Design a protein around this nucleic acid. Structure first.
Ligand SMILES: [Ca+2]
Ligand SMILES: [Ca+2]
Ligand SMILES: [Zn+2]
Ligand SMILES: [Zn+2]
Ligand SMILES: [Zn+2]
Lengths: 276, 204, 51, 276
DNA sequence: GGAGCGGATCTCGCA
DNA sequence: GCTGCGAGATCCGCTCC
DNA sequence: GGAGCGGATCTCGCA
DNA sequence: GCTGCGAGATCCGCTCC
């Protein structure tokens, strides 16, 4: 055990084996072998970079914008994250003024709330940021040299080019082909359960009305007592909290200390008596 | 089911329009149109997804204007000149952005042609060309033109590009403006589209 | 909805009906474990109810 | 049904929708929509290439050979498919004579039976093929411009370079570093259940002896009657067949008509009486 | 037992 | 003070006629 | 309830 | 008349002390 630890350490120094090999050879614990191999400076220096990956924002009023080239043609593409609706336009160049005109036309057609884009001569500048602040749109810029950040628009690039290849012979005008592919990718898709992306966008916009939420101003208000649960060990009651929503078998509590929403089963929830 | 006889009786008693009956009884649009056509008084003398197309001159600027009759939704663009190819491209983009079902316009060179008529039959939209008879479309489009030019005059110096001013005017007249029960001319169109979708899904 | 497992996003589970939706996150019923789960708005999609 | 089929066909001609979209819109069967979409010449022309992939031979005495470059050094690598044992050698160039010397030395060290390689100035030639026929080694050449064919040696290239990066400072001579990485990748690996690849190769070579199989020349011989089973429908008895191996609940029969080995349950197997 | 069918699974290429 | 993605093919396992 | 542990899962880069 | 591959990280769900 302890006696053969220096032997395993020197063997790994001499040959740079693996933790499993050391454990199977010298009988040392797997944890000890892992500690030995992870402490090797040579192994750390030449180790392969970590492989962890995330996901895009996928907001409701979230749009990703990008440029693309197609046979000496420049196309600007906007992609809605939630529904999947796309909007493409032929642009002469990539100047800031053209992008500003296109983006404010895009705002005019429908009202977004956030935008995601990468670094670029026109995406980031002085005038464009002022315009976005004037419109009131949250703008986020991805990590440079990470095209995977705007994955959705990149995939829609494929889905647009592949379909547009079919409609070129049908129409003599390129803008006509763009409108046709917008038809076949927005209205005539009808994918999944049988709802086109335009239908999803229309439904989401319709339900977004705040006047519906403002129709009723009277609702019962209740307060509750709850405690944390760490590793199955009960804690202590932490103040009174306003009930967010009451279902069956569980409840939702907003912790101010962590400023986060948590779910608590009825076995750890109690109710204060109502005012009388 | 009884809504159809109720609407028939109410139209016999009062002779209202199809849109009001559709909104207040929820009857199918086809049934409302059938009731309207079956009235001899109305026949011998305001539809959803019904559009009007017009041209506008603005101190040498050519503007193409699309107006929805039921909802005050205005779509304005800049056109280099009155040409059949440009009109076809613009109308295909317009059908790309919206989901129309009918169109009304005047008798014009680019409006009336074999190519554009074939293209509109290809899209599958009813077209009516001629002198308007209902004394509502002319006044509505005149108001649209007047408001559009007034807003364009107001907002031109703030921005640089003319298309920028046009987009700003569209923003002001389609979203920012409100009326009735605090509703916008763009939310009404979305509500109507959602109602049509749910009715179509329920029926077939 | 979707969850994060082993540092990577999971598959798009659903469809399902939302129970309560507030700012930042919504609470939903899960079928795999019959447990309530709260999920932020950054990993959800909104769909009208089916037929 | 039949009435709306021309409508769906013309709609797909006009817009080039998807089969699911047509099925959800016009109510036509999914099979009909699939037939319509697959018959579209435009869709067929622009469709993405098929994605089917296979696997390497993974034989017992199967070896894959390849060249590689490492900082103005040329290394020839041989990889055994079954055990995973590797053998690398520094080579001055890529001439045919050097490859012939290296490959016959490789044969001298241990006896293989088959080799897999790609097209090359030295892999395929007149003298090398004569040498391989002289030695009696089956040679297979992969598809040109398909480096994925020799996947095993390509992966061992990574596993060799990554480990060799660690041992360069330890030894002044490059050949010493190659021998050290051979040590740490062949003998000191001890991966999996706790057996090094050299152990697997040694065991496989030891059990390959034919004298063990030739020790016994007496064994009971039996014959059997069997019939085919197609879609659960019984067939007819097809001649007498020699039993290959008799277990419990099943038997193995070599069909001469298909020249293939099949497994038949006891419910479809009967035995002829033994000679008396 | 024939039959279609919903869904898990695969690769590859946008930057 | 943040992020990979899905369209287009192919069968299995299923149940229903 | 603490504890380690065997194994499914992930990406990326050989050509 | 044939072919993608695995090493190196990371947690879950497990059971045993
Ligand atoms: Ca890009
Ligand atoms: Ca190679
Ligand atoms: Zn080490
Ligand atoms: Zn009438
Ligand atoms: Zn087609």
């Amino acid at each position: 055990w302890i006696e053969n630890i220096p032997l395993a350490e020197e063997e790994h120094n001499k040959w740079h084996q693996d933790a499993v090999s050391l454990h199977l050879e010298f009988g040392i614990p797997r944890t000890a072998a892992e500690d030995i191999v992870q402490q090797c400076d040579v192994c750390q220096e030449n180790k392969m970079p970590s492989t962890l990956r995330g996901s895009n924002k996928r907001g409701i009023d979230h749009w990703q914008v990008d440029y693309t080239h197609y046979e000496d043609k420049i196309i600007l593409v906007w992609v809605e994250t939630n529904s999947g609706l796309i909007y493409a336009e032929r642009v002469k160049g990539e100047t800031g003024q053209e992008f500003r005109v296109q983006t404010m036309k895009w705002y005019a057609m429908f009202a977004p709330k956030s935008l995601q884009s990468d670094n670029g001569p026109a995406f980031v500048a002085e005038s464009t940021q002022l315009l976005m602040k004037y419109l009131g749109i949250e703008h986020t810029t991805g990590i440079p040299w990470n095209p995977q950040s705007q994955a959705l628009v990149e995939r829609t690039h494929q889905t647009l080019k592949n379909t547009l290849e079919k409609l070129i012979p049908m129409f003599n005008a390129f803008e006509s082909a763009l409108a046709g592919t917008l038809i076949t990718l927005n209205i005539k898709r009808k994918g999944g359960l049988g709802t086109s992306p335009m239908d999803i966008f229309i439904f989401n916009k319709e339900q977004q009305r705040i006047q519906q939420q403002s129709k009723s101003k009277q609702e019962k208000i209740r307060f509750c007592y709850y405690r944390t649960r760490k590793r199955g060990h009960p804690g202590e009651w932490q103040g009174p909290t306003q009930v967010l929503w009451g279902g069956d078998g569980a409840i939702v509590v907003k912790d101010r200390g962590t400023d986060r929403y948590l779910v608590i089963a009825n076995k750890d929830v109690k109710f204060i008596p109502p005012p009388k």
